[PDB]
Amino acid sequence: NLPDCDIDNWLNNVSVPSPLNWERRIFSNCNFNLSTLLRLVHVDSFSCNNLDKSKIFGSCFNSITVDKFAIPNRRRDDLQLGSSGFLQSSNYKIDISSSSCQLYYSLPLVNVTINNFNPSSWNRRYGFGSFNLSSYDVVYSDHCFSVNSDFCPCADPSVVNSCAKSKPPSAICPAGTKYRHCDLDTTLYVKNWCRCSCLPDPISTYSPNTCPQKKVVVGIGEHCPGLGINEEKCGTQLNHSSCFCSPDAFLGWSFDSCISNNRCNIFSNFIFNGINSGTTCSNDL
């Protein structure tokens, strides 16, 4: 009388994610069948680590952490276990030491739509939105940058109302935050020359210490804390104006597609839990 998990319905959903915004569904207290999961899903390849593939039949689990995200064509090879590629260091780390069965499969291009996102607060209170692209692209981060719970990309109205060269854009930051760095300097005859912080671009800042934008790596369970923002591209020049950063500043992202033989590629790292233990068992016999 115990119902089915219907895991196959979740992978074959019309909404297909990206490695930047991989989700997680904790399947628990329901049935399944690996034969039906192998048949109803057009599998490219199926592999298991730290758990025998033949031992899934009959043995069961407490809760299955099921993740999914689409495969870029140029990033198919980076999903190797333990690699240091962009996907495994800035999109989704795969815990090698835990029981994980990886599944490779594709969905037809007629019923696949992609809801790209950017899990983060540091880079979504400060101007962002539709990832400008076409009807079949899959974002993938190539370097994740983390910042404090106080970095106002926008500079300070006053320093600039008195600067006179390198006038970097500026806006009133939000109640509870701290103005960006700026060291009013002098060179030969150019007076008050302001070289505000994180100047060139978050990935060319030869000051990996002065730029509050520090570099980081994703982590089992945790998505990307934040992407990249040219700090000379965030803000209008008018002063009395909120910290509206602009859509053309998001650098650190790349739009490779998802189309292999007339079909879109998707992956999964079914994280497991509780061998020979649980109430989410199966009828595989």
Added chain:
Amino acid sequence: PSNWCDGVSHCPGGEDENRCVRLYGPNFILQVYSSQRKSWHPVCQDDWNENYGRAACRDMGYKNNFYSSQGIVDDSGSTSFMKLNTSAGNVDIYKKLYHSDACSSKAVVSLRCIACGVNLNSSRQSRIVGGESALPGAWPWQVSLHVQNVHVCGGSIITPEWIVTAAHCVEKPLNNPWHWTAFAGILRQSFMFYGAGYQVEKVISHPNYDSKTKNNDIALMKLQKPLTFNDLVKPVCLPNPGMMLQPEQLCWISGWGATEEKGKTSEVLNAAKVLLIETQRCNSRYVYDNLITPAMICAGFLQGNVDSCQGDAGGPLVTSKNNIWWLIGDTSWGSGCAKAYRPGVYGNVMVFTDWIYRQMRADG
């Protein structure tokens, strides 16, 4: 001076263009300017004896100094070589040179006019900001210049009689050689007090030096008494046109500068490793907003923490190549000390290598 090596004959005899001589390459391949084709061509080893080497170094602002001379296989890819002849009864070498397709010995001349670019072996020396102590003898060209027996700017030597430094230290009213006093081969600033001074007989400043943009910043102190060379004091070879100085190349800076900005000068000579910064990278809108003239060099780290400071001015920018040190830059000015995005800015000696020789020969 300035009338030398310009393509126009000034004196009626025309010695200005017929005697234009310079070295070339890290292996010191001699060149002689050909007035008929307006180009520099190397010389043959064939039928050459050491007496002509005396005349070559003398016209090269090196007077009688002559270390060694031997023949090496050509590497510059030149199509023509100067060829000597012994049938002429005259005593001048330049009337004896004529063009030839190739030399019989298949070699060109490596001319050394002074034993420079060699120091005692030193292991650990990174004494400018963020480092450890130094050892004596590793930088024997480095000298300190004093006004009223206190340090103002550093200096480096290239001959027993000449010291190069920055022009902003010798700016008015400090353009009088009586005020300057140089000390050679002493590491501790507490020891350069009693009788160790070498007075400067005449200060030389660049004629087109301009203080607003601080470009063409070069200066030449000349001593009355030539420096007696030993293990603790040795010159550094003036670099030649035609070396492919790679980007990021490991160079060494030295001087008695402060360990931090606005701080007091160091008691002991400091010297640490820095890196080259390419000039088109430096003169962009970002690094200095087109402030870098072609006679200027940016060196150090954009991340900072290893840079020149006040008192490091006049110091040498040296690199190691074929076991010979080359003085490619002179510390002109620095926006802060040990700071990011504002590295050390250095004057290009390479643009002014010919200008040094023009003062060397006229004041010999």
